[PDB]
UniProtKB/Swiss-Prot annotation, chains A, B, C, D, E, F:
This is Bacterial non-heme ferritin. Fe cation 2 binds at residues 56, 100, 133. It catalyses: 4 Fe(2+) + O2 + 6 H2O = 4 iron(III) oxide-hydroxide + 12 H(+). SUPFAM superfamilies: Ferritin-like. The gene is ftnA. It comes from Helicobacter pylori (strain J99 / ATCC 700824).
Amino acid sequence: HHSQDPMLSKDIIKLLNEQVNKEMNSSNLYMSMSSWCYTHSLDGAGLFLFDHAAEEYEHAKKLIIFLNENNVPVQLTSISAPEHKFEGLTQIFQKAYEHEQHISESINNIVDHAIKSKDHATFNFLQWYVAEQHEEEVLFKDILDKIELIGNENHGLYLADQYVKGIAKSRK
Amino acid sequence: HHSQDPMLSKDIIKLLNEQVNKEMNSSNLYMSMSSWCYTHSLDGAGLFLFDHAAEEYEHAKKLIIFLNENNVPVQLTSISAPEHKFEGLTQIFQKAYEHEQHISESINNIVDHAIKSKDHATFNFLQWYVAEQHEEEVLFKDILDKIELIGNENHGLYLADQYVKGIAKSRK
Amino acid sequence: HHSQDPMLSKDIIKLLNEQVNKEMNSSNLYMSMSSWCYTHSLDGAGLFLFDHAAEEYEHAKKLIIFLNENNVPVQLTSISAPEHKFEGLTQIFQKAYEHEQHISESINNIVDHAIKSKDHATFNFLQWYVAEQHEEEVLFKDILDKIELIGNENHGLYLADQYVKGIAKSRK
Amino acid sequence: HHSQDPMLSKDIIKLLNEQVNKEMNSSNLYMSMSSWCYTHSLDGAGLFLFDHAAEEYEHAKKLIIFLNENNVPVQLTSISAPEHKFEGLTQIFQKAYEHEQHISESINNIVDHAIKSKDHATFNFLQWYVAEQHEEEVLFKDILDKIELIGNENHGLYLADQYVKGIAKSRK
Amino acid sequence: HHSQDPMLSKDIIKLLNEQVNKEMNSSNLYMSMSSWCYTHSLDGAGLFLFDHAAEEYEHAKKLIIFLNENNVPVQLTSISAPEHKFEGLTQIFQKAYEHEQHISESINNIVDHAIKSKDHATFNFLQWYVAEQHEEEVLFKDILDKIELIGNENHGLYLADQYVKGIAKSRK
Amino acid sequence: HHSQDPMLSKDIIKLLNEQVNKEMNSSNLYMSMSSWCYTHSLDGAGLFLFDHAAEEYEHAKKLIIFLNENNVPVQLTSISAPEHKFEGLTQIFQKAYEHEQHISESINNIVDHAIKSKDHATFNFLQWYVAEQHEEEVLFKDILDKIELIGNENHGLYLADQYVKGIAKSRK
Ligand SMILES: [Fe+3]
Ligand SMILES: [Fe+3]
Ligand SMILES: [Fe+3]
Ligand SMILES: [Fe+3]
Ligand SMILES: [Fe+3]
Ligand SMILES: [Fe+3]
Ligand SMILES: [Fe+3]
Ligand SMILES: [Fe+3]
Ligand SMILES: [Fe+3]
Ligand SMILES: [Fe+3]
Ligand SMILES: [Fe+3]
Ligand SMILES: [Fe+3]
Ligand SMILES: [Fe+3]
Ligand SMILES: [Fe+3]
């Protein structure tokens, strides 16, 4: 039987499929970062990062749904193993903030290509994703700011972790 | 600062980490099977398999939580690209049922090792997982049975897909 | 059309089918014991034993459902006629307690074989059945204890029967 | 101690005891037919026949209650192994309908004997049973009619099974 | 008058009675640890450990009930005065965590023997106890992790005690 | 760091700590007596004595709280195993009543010493304990009176146990 062709252009298909794989990779990285925190007495950051990992996977699913609805084949590639070696809480959040900046940039690129191609169905679709990503980037900036304000001397790590614990709990 | 050692034995830790990666692999395979269905006018099976993919990831998360609570580092490996080319609905569900049999066997292996190790905290933890996996395996057996009963003649594909659509909607 | 093979091993199939037939036999025995009590002015024990008979049949049904769901043929054999000759209330409950001990042993055997075969779907399934059987065995032990404490002199049979009547009513 | 004699005549007692054993036999036959369906991808008929088997046992219990209340010893015989090999859905429902005709006739015989004996307590007691059996006989007539109308061609079996599934679910 | 024999095997009886006594002794140890904290300005840990002592006695009672229901004589042994001298908060929780590990191991031993014995009534009964003990062990690991993370420099002891206080209150 | 001295006098401390241990001893004694009843078909007395044992431990806990709040070290001592061999229901309740008289006497002694010491915080605190112990002593007098009224003979033991069972349940 005949099924309708993909409803999106080849370039937009490529960018969206790449994005699904970025979000899956991201999810694995945050699970790894979360585990590091949990195994180093930082269960506040552990919880926060675990919940954030699950959220990135929710983004991958929503992108997959959009590809499905447009009759676009989902192309899952090999998801490379995430980094597991970390130095401490500050380095984890520095790496995470830089990672969120890269994710924001990748989304801005898809949205820009949608504009150039005149694919306004995709432009309109991606708006929740732009908004939620901006909120996540700001969140990591704020937590990093706080970790650096507190510092790691004289029970600072505990204070930072409790601070993050409070954020994690308020968000669920 | 000193954090407590992993609370589980090395063998149990390795099997559980392997199981996490099994469920992630599973989730990707089912997303790919789902996509195939969606792009071949089988949105009932597409939905069913998408929701099943998501459920497998939920199992991975639950295993991760148990690892975190026991101070066990989570070791996420590379996730390999899933199969993406399929012959049809029957082949997909034959493959899927065979896959679910393998998953069931893999869980039985962990539970067996927990008994042999006298790790009854892990034995007890795994009971929800044994139960839910059994229900999933029976489900795939039932769907495969139905696809085979209906046949692909005439509008058999439509009929099988609608039947799977009904199951997908009922399980939400 | 092709239907999937039985999902359980041959040994577990045999033990489970035998158990369905044990529970059906048990149900008939309790109906017979119940009738003896009713026709000898012991309507308390009559009711209790009737309700217990119906419960054993409910166990047979739940086992049948599990066999059905695993695509395992239910093999009902000839159910031999139950004993009908009884000496009195004490002998009925002595026989019944010994019978419940045999039923408990038979269930422990299936669960042990599930462990040996690594069939943890069946092990997990049987847990309600282990729990409910233990409660029933304890119940018969308690009633037997009470019948022997009261004794059969000077309206003791009436007191024992009213005691059992109270238990029967509280359980429904 | 002296207990009152059976409150019913010998002929009525024998017919009622025979009817109890008829319903137990019936229940087993239907469990076996149900199993056949479940193991041949007909879970709609499997469910319908399982629930019907259970209902026949409920009739046996109700007859037992009446016997107990009249101080009539219940005589449970050996229950013979039911037929387990069947040709298909149509043959099962042909056999089942014929079986229900025989059950209806057997009840008519008891009611007739009650009239001839002037046993109007038994006549009156049996009215729920006459009524419910008539509804059961009509049901099997209707299902057989539908199976024959649909046919087994193409996906006829699927269609008939789904129709029976709908009836099974509606009767709960 | 004759009472029924104990319903459990001699080895299971010995292990269960030993466990009752272990829980009683645990309650004493925790009361003593609690008192140390209350008398050294650590009312957070004081409260936590008092409430935990009380919960160990609740375990002893649940074990006693199971022995009673099986007609197994409870054999309470002599109590030896618990340790009353401690060095500080950290040492108390190090000792406590080590104690909880010993308790977990002792339960795993009973569960293992129940398996080897084919005593699945006992296996099944112990499952709440396995699950609750694992939760207690994890809790003591978490608290010790937090105590080590905070330190006793500056007002570290205050912060750690306040942390434990919050946990004690949240568990009520 | 400096913690405040005990707020009670040395003599009052000694008597209160001895009292904690008396209550602990009572708990054990009543658990043992309870077990004897349960293994000799007297589940009414079994339940009554078990619940009483638990209530004695509640008294110990309440005394412990008062010591803690006053910065008084809890001094839990070695206690002999409780008696495990008994002659029968009457002898158990005679021993128990005698025991309750001794406990009452021990409380009166502390209250007396509080008056003499002008320790009215302690006098005031103990009033619930005086009141509850008086009720318990009266209760054991009433049960013993009833046991002696009923007698051992001609199902008297059963009647006495059912009577105690009613009290056990009414007290919740
Ligand atoms: Fe993000
Ligand atoms: Fe994102
Ligand atoms: Fe699965
Ligand atoms: Fe799974
Ligand atoms: Fe039973
Ligand atoms: Fe049973
Ligand atoms: Fe019928
Ligand atoms: Fe009928
Ligand atoms: Fe059709
Ligand atoms: Fe514990
Ligand atoms: Fe414990
Ligand atoms: Fe008292
Ligand atoms: Fe007292
Ligand atoms: Fe009397």
